[PDB]
């Protein structure tokens, strides 16, 4: 079950404050869904790095009252390991049709 | 840079 996943160890796929450069770095030439978390250049703010059919796609993470997310009604998460965990199973779809996957696999799974 | 649009 998916007590088993790599998405549990937050160092799997939190890498700090590297910048979009850096996270270009990591992951080109991985497989669709392999993804990164990391500060943004919007001091403040995080962002999701993730393969999409082959490029690259950078995300920003909101942080509300109610939680981090990527958009509203869904800014819910406690943590950046609780959104990490939602999007496993949540194609990211919903909120761009550009975006179908999933945060599959932590760039150091 | 540039990120993705999630709408509301």
């Known amino acids: ?109 | 840079g540039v990120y993705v649009k999630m709408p509301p």
């Open chain 1, 1 to 109: 079950g998916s007590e088993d996943l790599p998405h549990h160890d937050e160092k799997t796929w939190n890498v700090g404050s590297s910048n979009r450069n850096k996270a270009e770095n990591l992951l080109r030439g991985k497989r669709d869904g392999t993804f990164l978390v990391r500060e943004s250049s919007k001091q403040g703010s995080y962002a999701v790095s993730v393969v999409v059919d082959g490029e690259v796609k950078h995300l920003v993470i909101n942080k509300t009252a109610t939680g981090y997310g990527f958009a509203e009604p869904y800014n819910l998460y406690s943590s950046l390991k609780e959104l990490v965990l939602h999007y496993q199973h949540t194609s990211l779809v919903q909120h761009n049709d550009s975006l179908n996957v999933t945060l599959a696999y932590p760039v150091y799974a």
